[PDB]
Amino acid sequence: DTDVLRKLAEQVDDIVFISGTNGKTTTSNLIGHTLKANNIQIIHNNEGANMAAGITSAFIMQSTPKTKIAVIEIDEGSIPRVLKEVTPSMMVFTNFFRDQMDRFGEIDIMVNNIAETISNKGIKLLLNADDPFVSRLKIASDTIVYYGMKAHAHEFEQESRYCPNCGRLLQYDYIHYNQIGHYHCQCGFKREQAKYEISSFDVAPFLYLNINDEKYDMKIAGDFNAYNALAAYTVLRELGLNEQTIKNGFETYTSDNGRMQYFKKERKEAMINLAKNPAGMNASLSVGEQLEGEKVYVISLNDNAADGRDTSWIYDADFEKLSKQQIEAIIVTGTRAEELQLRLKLAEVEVPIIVERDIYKATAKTMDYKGFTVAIPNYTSLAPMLEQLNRSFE
Amino acid sequence: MHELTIYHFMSDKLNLYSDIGNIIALRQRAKKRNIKVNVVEINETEGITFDECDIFFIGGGSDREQALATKELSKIKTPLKEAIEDGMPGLTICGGYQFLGKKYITPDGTELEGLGILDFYTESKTNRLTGDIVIESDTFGTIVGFENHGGRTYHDFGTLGHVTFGYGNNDEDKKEGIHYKNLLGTYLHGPILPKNYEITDYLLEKACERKGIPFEPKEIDNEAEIQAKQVLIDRANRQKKSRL
Ligand SMILES: Nc1ncnc2c1ncn2[C@@H]1O[C@H](COP(=O)(O)OP(=O)(O)NP(=O)(O)O)[C@@H](O)[C@H]1O
Ligand SMILES: [Mg+2]
Ligand SMILES: [Zn+2]
């Protein structure tokens, strides 16, 4: 079966591996989504099964005569095992973050083992120039492509680092976050110039990227996802895709867990974002400020065991700020919809409140409005609300 | 417009029960009677005086924060008790209510000193009294809330009412909280005040007449409050019918 993978992979022209400690899945999804949005048959372990068996399984179940590109997310610790049977043409690495519970220098050791494993195989390596420990993999191929982010592209929501070439303390001209930044040892190991670079971006509420003098209007959020998008951008370009083809798929990709998850049908738009505590609610209530036009809210408050039976925390949330927004109506739902109605009355939020305790009906009701749906469930409300939203958007 | 002043004691340490919601309920009910409410947060008692106070409020903290709050409040035990004895309106929540009494006994038998304002005690047990609670009061109407406390409080004063669903102060009495003069105390969460507007209006009204300012209009719109109460009333009944 390890010979069957070897046999299956041989008939695939382009095999792209995605690895690193964080962001592999988002990166890999952006790549597979964008190719699929262009009618390119691909093998894609789109479920995150990034170990040898799951990679083997994807190849078995998805390979066809028309499958030109394999897009494979790989657990970094499985790189040696998979390389015995598959050699990729291209490999992108996102980052290498040492966790605080990791033992002494388990990172550089991991990166050496990876560099030794992939060494001298003609693999085109796509490296995060801003991560010193990804950039250390430059020693492992003669075909290196850098991506990175211009200094001051974004103000990220922020221990000490040692050079991976010579081991001396690293000097940084600028820090994006943690170890990600513009560094330069005295040994010569430095932050190299990037072939593809983000000059600036913002999150208002979704990523809006500026890559090599082109603008990408995303439908996912999260600071850190600019890097995953840029990594996916770099794969797609190196596969020969053009700005427009890449832009088409980047503009439609969305998350699927109910966290800043976007929806669209014709001109009607919605966004759903889980909030189950004062800080999560405040952030979900803020999203509407950054959306243009009238908004229609559906907010769900269940009080099941997993939610907690005490709903008093909604008084610690800043529902009063909704008065600064342009809102057609707020539908309150869940087993404790009436606490939400009463909370909003005391918030002096003077828009129509519709009490509809059935989460399904309350959520579908937002389709009756033309404004941007902002949908906010607490924990046990999420699955029914998300399911209705997928129903309503076809 | 008229003003009323709330002394909010130890708002920093005694912060476990979403006190702000009780503050909001008082601000909003008074605002519909054209009364502006100023809240004075009092976390240090040094020569504090009740001359300028219309209603006081003491929230609940953890066992450790309660004892430290009690130690700080004991610096004005006599100005406080004489204010209560003069009819000063007050609301106290969980620990802020329990430490009005003589002592609080933790589950392991540990004995914490209260203010001793009133002659009662509380003794905690590990198995908690938890759930929806529906109370029928002759002063506050139907009081509706959530309870979740290990403390069993034992006093021979008047209470917020009779418990038709839930426990109240302890396992046996089917009576909730304390009502002494204009001082209220309770174990209820929600917080208590937003749904239970007769309690909010009682305190505002007592402070209005003692100050000599009017409380008009007296009857206002309560639909949202009553709809929120009714959820718990209906569910309590269901739990009763489903226990046959
Ligand atoms: N570029 C990034 N930099 C730092 N953190 C990130 C980045 N991308 C994602 N993360 C965080 O990492 C978490 C996991 O993201 P994901 O895309 O699932 O990474 P992954 O590498 O696939 N994880 P795993 O398969 O468990 O090794 C996310 O919830 C983010 O909080
Ligand atoms: Mg993954
Ligand atoms: Zn160096």
Author numbering:
A (entry chain B): 36 to 193, 198 to 433
B (entry chain A): 1 to 244
Q: What did the publication describing this PDB structure actually write?
A:
The structure of this complex was solved at 2.14 Å resolution using molecular replacement, and the corresponding electron density allowed us to unambiguously model AMPPNP into a binding site in the middle domain of MurT. The binding site contains the consensus sequence GTNGKT19, with residues K59 stabilizing the β and γ phosphate groups of AMPPNP and T60 coordinating a magnesium ion that is also contacted by the side chain of the conserved MurT-E108 residue. The ATP molecule required for catalysis, replaced here by the non-hydrolyzable analog β,γ-imidoadenosine 5′-triphosphate (AMPPNP), is bound at the base of helix αm1 with the adenine moiety bound in a cleft formed next to helix αm1 while the phosphates are contacted by residues from strands βm1 and βm3. The observed binding mode is in excellent agreement with our mutagenesis data, as single or double mutants of nucleotide-binding site residues (T60A, E108A and N267Y) have completely lost their enzymatic activity. Complex formation with an ATP analog revealed a nucleotide-binding site in MurT that is similar to those found in other Mur ligases.
In order to provide insight into the overall organization of this complex and to facilitate an understanding of the amidation mechanism, we have determined the crystal structure of the GatD/MurT complex. We find that the two proteins assemble into a curved, boomerang-shaped structure, with GatD docking to the C-terminal domain of MurT.
